[PDB]
mmCIF file of C-alpha atoms in Angstrom:
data_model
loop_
_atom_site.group_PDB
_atom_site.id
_atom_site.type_symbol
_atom_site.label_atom_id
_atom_site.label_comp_id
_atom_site.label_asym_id
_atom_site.label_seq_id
_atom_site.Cartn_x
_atom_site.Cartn_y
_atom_site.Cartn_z
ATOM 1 C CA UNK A 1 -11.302 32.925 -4.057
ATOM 2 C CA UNK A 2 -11.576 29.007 -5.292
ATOM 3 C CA UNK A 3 -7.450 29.378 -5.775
ATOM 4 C CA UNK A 4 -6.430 27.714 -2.843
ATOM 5 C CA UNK A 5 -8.981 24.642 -3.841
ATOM 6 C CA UNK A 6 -7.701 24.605 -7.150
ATOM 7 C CA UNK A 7 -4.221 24.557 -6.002
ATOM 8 C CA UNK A 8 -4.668 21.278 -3.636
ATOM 9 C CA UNK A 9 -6.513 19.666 -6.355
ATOM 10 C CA UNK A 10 -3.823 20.505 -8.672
ATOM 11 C CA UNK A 11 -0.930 18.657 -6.342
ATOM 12 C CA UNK A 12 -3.225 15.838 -5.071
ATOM 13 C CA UNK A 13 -3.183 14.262 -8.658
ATOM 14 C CA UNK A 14 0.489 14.695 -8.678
ATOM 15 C CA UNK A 15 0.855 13.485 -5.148
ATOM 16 C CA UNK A 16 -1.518 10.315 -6.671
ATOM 17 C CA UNK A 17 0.217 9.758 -10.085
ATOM 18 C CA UNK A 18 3.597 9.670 -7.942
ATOM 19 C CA UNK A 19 1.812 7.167 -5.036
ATOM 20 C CA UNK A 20 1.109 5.229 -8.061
ATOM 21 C CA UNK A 21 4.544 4.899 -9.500
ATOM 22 C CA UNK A 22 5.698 3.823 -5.831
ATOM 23 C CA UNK A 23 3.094 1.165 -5.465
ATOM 24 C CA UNK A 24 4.449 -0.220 -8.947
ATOM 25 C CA UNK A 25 7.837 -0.521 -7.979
ATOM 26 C CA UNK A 26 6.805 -2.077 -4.275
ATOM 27 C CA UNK A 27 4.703 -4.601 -6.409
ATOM 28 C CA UNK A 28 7.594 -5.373 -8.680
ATOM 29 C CA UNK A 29 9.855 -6.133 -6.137
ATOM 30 C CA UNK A 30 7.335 -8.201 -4.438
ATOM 31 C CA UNK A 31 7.245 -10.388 -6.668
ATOM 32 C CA UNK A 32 10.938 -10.413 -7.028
ATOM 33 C CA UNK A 33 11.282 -11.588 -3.483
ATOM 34 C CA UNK A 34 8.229 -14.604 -3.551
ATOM 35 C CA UNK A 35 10.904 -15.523 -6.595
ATOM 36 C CA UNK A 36 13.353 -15.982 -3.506
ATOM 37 C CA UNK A 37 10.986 -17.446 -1.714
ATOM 38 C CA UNK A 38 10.126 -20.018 -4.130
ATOM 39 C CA UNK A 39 13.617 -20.906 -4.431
ATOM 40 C CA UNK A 40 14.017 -21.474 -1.055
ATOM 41 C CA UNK A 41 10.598 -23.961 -0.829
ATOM 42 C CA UNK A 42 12.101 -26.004 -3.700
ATOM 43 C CA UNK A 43 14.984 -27.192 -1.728
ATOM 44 C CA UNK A 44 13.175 -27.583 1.637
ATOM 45 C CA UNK A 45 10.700 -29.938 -0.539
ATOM 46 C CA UNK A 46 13.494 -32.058 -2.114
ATOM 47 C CA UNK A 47 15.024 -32.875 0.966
ATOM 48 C CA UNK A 48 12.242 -32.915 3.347
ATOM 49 C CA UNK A 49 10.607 -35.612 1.331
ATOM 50 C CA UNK B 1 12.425 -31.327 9.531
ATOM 51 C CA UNK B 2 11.661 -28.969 6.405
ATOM 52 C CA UNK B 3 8.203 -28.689 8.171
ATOM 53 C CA UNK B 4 8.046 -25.670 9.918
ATOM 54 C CA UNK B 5 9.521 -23.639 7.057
ATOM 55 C CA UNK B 6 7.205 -25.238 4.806
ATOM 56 C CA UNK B 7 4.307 -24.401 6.583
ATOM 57 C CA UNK B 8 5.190 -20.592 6.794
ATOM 58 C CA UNK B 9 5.768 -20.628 3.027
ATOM 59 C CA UNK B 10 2.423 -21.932 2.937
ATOM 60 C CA UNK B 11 0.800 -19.249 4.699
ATOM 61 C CA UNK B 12 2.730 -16.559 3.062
ATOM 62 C CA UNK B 13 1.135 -17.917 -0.046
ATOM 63 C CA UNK B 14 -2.312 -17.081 1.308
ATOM 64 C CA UNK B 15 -1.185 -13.804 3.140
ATOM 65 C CA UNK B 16 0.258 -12.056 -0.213
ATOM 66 C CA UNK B 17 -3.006 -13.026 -1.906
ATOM 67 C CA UNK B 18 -4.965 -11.925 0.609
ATOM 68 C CA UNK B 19 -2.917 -7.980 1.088
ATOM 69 C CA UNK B 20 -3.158 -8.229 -3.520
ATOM 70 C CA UNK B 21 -7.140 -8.486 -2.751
ATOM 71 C CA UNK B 22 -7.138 -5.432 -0.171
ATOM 72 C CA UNK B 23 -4.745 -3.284 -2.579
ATOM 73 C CA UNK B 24 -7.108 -3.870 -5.233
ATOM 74 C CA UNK B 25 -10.175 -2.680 -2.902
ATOM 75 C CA UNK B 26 -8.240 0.475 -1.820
ATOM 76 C CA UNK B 27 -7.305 1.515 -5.105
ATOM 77 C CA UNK B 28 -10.880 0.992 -6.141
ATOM 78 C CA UNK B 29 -11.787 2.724 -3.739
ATOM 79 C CA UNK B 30 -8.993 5.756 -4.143
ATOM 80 C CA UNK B 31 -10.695 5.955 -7.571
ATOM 81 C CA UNK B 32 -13.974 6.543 -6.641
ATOM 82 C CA UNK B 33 -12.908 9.379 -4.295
ATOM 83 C CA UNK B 34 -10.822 11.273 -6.956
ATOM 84 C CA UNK B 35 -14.269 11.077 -9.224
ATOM 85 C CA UNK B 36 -15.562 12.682 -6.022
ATOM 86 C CA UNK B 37 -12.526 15.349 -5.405
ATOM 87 C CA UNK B 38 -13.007 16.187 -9.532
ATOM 88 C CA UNK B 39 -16.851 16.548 -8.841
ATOM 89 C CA UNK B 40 -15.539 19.963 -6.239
ATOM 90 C CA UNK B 41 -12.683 20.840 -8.729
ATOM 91 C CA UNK B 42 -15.259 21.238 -11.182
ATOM 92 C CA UNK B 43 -17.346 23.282 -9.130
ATOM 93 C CA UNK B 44 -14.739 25.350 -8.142
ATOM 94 C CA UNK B 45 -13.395 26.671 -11.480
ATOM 95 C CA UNK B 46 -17.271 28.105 -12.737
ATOM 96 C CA UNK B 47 -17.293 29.690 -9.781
ATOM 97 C CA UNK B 48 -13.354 30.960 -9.808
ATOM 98 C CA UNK B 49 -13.461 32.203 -13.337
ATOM 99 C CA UNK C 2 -28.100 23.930 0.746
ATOM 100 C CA UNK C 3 -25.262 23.538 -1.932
ATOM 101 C CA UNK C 4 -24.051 20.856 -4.052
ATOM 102 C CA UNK C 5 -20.653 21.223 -2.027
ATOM 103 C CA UNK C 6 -22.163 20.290 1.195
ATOM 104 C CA UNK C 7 -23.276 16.557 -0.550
ATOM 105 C CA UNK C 8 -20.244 16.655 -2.218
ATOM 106 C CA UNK C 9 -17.792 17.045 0.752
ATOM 107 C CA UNK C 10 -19.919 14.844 2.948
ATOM 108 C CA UNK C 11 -19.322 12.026 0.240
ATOM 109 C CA UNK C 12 -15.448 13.000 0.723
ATOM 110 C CA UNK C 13 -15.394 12.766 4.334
ATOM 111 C CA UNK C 14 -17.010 9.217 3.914
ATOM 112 C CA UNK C 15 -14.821 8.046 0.984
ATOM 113 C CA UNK C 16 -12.078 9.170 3.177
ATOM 114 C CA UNK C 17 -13.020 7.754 6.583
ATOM 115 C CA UNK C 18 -13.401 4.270 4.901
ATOM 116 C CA UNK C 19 -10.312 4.551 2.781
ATOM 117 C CA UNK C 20 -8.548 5.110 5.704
ATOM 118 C CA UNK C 21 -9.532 2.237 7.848
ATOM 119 C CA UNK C 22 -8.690 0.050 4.601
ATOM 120 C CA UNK C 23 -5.545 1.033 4.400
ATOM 121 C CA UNK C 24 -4.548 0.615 8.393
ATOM 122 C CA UNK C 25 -6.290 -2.443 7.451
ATOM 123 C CA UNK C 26 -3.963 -3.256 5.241
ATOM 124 C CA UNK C 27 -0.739 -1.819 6.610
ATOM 125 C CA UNK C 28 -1.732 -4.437 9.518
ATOM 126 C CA UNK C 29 -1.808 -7.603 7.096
ATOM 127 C CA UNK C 30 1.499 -6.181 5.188
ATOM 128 C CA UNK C 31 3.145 -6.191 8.315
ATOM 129 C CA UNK C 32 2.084 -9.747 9.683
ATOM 130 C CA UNK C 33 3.060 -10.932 6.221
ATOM 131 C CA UNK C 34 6.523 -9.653 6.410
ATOM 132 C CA UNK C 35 6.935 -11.226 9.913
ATOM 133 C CA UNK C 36 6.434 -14.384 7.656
ATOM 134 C CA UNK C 37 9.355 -13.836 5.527
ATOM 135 C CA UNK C 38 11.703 -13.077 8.455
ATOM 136 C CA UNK C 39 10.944 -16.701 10.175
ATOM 137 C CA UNK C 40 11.324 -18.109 6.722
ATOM 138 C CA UNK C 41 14.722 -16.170 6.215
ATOM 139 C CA UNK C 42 15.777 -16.921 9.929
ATOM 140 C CA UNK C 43 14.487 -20.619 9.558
ATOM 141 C CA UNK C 44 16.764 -20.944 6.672
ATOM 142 C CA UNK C 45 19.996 -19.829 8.333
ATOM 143 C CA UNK C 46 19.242 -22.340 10.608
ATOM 144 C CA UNK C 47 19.205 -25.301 8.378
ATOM 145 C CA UNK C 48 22.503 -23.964 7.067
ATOM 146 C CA UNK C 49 24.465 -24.156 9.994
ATOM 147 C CA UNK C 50 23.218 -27.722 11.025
ATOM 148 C CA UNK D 2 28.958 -22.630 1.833
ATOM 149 C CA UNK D 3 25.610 -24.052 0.896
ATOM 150 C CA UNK D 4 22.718 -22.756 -1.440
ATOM 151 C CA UNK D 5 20.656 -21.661 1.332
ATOM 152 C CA UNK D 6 22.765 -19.247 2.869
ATOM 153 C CA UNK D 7 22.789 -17.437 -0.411
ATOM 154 C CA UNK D 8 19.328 -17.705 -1.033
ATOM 155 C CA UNK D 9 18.364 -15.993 2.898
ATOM 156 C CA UNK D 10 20.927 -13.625 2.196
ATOM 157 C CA UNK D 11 19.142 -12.384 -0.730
ATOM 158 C CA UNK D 12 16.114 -12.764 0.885
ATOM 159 C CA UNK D 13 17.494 -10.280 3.428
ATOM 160 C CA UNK D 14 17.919 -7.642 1.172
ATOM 161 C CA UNK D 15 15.350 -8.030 -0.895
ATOM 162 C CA UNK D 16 12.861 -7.427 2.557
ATOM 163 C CA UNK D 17 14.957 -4.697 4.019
ATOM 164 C CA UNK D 18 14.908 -2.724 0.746
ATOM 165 C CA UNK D 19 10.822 -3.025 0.223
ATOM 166 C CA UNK D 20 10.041 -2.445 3.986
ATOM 167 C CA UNK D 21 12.304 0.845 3.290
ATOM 168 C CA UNK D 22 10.303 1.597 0.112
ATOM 169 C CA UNK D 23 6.520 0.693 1.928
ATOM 170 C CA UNK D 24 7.763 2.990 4.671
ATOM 171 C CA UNK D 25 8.637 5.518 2.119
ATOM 172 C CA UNK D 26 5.284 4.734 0.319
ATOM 173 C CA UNK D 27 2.975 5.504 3.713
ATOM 174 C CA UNK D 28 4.392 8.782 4.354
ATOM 175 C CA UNK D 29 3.575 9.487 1.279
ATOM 176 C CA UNK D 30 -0.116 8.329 1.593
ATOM 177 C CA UNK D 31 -0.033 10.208 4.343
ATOM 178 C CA UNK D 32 0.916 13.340 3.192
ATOM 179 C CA UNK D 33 -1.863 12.947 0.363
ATOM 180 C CA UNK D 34 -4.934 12.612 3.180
ATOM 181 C CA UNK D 35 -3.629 15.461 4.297
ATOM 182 C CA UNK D 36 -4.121 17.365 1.327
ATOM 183 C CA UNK D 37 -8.283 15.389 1.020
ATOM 184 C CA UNK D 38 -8.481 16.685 4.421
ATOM 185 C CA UNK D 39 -7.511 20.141 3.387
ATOM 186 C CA UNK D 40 -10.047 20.154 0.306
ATOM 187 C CA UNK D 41 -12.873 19.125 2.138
ATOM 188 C CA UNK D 42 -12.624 21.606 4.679
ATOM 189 C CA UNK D 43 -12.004 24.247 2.327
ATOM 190 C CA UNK D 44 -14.850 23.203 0.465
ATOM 191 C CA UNK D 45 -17.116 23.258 3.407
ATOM 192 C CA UNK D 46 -15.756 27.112 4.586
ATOM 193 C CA UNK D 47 -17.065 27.691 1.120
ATOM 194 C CA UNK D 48 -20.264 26.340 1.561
ATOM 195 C CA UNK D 49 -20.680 28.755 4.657
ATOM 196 C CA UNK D 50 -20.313 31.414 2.729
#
């Protein structure tokens, strides 16, 4: 009856918990980039100016 | 010279901040909906059982 | 009648909107990572003179 | 030779590797609508009786 329900439920948190991971490690190197980016603004500055 | 880049870091600055605001809406919003999708899971397993 | 009609027309809205966030985003993400290529392209220009 | 070209190299990577992993992360948004989409019509069928 309710089993195909309970199924989807059942592998929409997993699909969730595992979107969730993914959007941590997209975050993570996010940031890692911007840290590239950063380093790249620091020498445009000191020479610009 | 250093100028243009500059500039572009600039707005990247504002972009990322801005797309970190709207990830923080959409996963409030992505909780709020799972609250919903337990709300029918609940349902479903008095019913199933 | 039920609680499941409430219920999945609280989905269907949660979802709609959820939805048009995330093209929302996906649009911003996008127009931010244009950014970081004429950064990255403006910076191999500096290097070769 | 200089700093820079280092520094838009990495850049380089670092952007093809998350647009690969955001890519990566959509389908797999994607994939979980899909199963919303699925409970909500399955809990409306129910809801006809």
């Amino acid at each position: 009856e309710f089993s195909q329900l309970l199924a989807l439920a059942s592998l929409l948190g997993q699909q969730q918990a595992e979107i969730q991971r993914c959007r941590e490690d997209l975050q993570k190197k996010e940031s890692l980039m911007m840290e590239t980016i950063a380093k790249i603004k620091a020498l445009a500055l000191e020479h610009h100016h």
